[PDB]
């Protein structure tokens, strides 16, 4: 607890911190091994479900965890080349997560659009490039920038006893990363649910009720464990001292929901996923 005074409160951050941590990673192994284990399961389609759930798994095992280690224990105690590995880390996994949905956004409209003309065409060394440039863009747009700030300008600049990115004071590449990773994101999602949802009303009109439901349930997820953190960041550089220290923390842990959420919104809609997870689940095999 160190600074936490008070631990017989403290306790219930704690605890459900620990809740969501274990629900992120028991949720997204579910996926993992429910495409091994399910032959029907193993279609180039279920290739973006299982390095989605890669992503969260990380996020779920080291950010969520290390994260809370720096909230009840109000400093960091690993040292300076232990902070950069863990940003790095966290903040290219949490970019991985969301360049996965916007290659599953795209794979899905394609799919609606293009019934017979796109997943032909689109094979396993296809989804590879799909999904490798989810990754490696992911990579190069973070950890070098995280890793190598202190050795290119300057020195390290960030209190011993804190831990951030330390770039995010200049107003200049924080909004360029920020656009890159949150706002362009969610510009081609929403536009290509909405362009989604204008062919399904228009299916059933030529021959809605789960259309709308759906897609507003998954847009709306992404959005508000999202949108916070993007916003307090916005006004963190212009700002000095204007946000409170428990409301940054309170949208830092936000983003982490997104992991815990991800495999309903994605895995649960198809109904072998659903049936495969309660055959785990309850006939433990
Ligand atoms: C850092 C971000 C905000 C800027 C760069 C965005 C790109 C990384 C994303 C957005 C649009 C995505 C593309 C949308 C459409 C396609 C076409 C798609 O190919 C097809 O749909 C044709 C059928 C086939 O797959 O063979 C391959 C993935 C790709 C290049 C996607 C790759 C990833 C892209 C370029
Ligand atoms: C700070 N946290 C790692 C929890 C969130 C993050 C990140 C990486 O950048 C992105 N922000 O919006 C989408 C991806």
Redesign the pocket.
């Given at each position: 607890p160190l600074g936490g005074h008070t631990v017989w409160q403290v306790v219930f951050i704690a605890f459900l911190t620990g809740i969501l941590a274990l629900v992120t990673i028991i949720g997204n192994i579910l996926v993992i091994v429910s495409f091994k284990v399910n032959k029907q399961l193993k279609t180039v389609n279920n290739y973006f479900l299982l390095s989605l759930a890669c992503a969260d798994l990380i996020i779920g095992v080291i950010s969520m965890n290390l994260f809370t280690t720096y909230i009840i224990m109000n400093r960091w105690a690993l040292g300076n080349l232990a902070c950069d590995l863990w940003l790095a880390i966290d903040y290219v996994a949490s970019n991985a997560s969301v360049?996965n949905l916007?290659?599953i956004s795209?794979d899905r409209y394609?799919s609606i659009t293009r019934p017979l003309t796109?997943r032909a065409?689109?094979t396993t060394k296809?989804a590879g490039?799909?999904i490798g440039?989810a990754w490696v863009?992911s990579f190069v747009?973070w950890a070098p920038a995280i890793l190598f700030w202190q050795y290119f300008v300057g020195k390290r600049t960030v209190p011993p006893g804190e831990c951030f990115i330390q770039f995010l004071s200049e107003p200049t590449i924080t909004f360029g990363t920020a656009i890159?990773?949150f706002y362009?994101?969610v510009t081609?999602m929403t536009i290509l649910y909405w362009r989604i949802y204008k062919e399904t009303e228009k299916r059933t009109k030529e021959l809605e009720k789960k259309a709308a439901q759906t897609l507003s349930a998954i847009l709306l997820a992404f959005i508000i464990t999202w949108t916070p953190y993007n916003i307090m960041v916005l006004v963190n550089t212009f700002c000095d001292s204007c946000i409170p220290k428990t409301f940054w923390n309170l949208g830092y842990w936000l983003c982490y929901i997104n992991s815990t959420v991800n495999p309903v919104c994605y895995a649960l809609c198809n109904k072998t996923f659903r049936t495969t997870f309660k055959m785990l689940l309850l006939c433990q095999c």
């Open positions: 360049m916007l290659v795209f394609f796109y065409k689109r296809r490039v799909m440039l863009i747009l890159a990773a362009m994101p081609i």
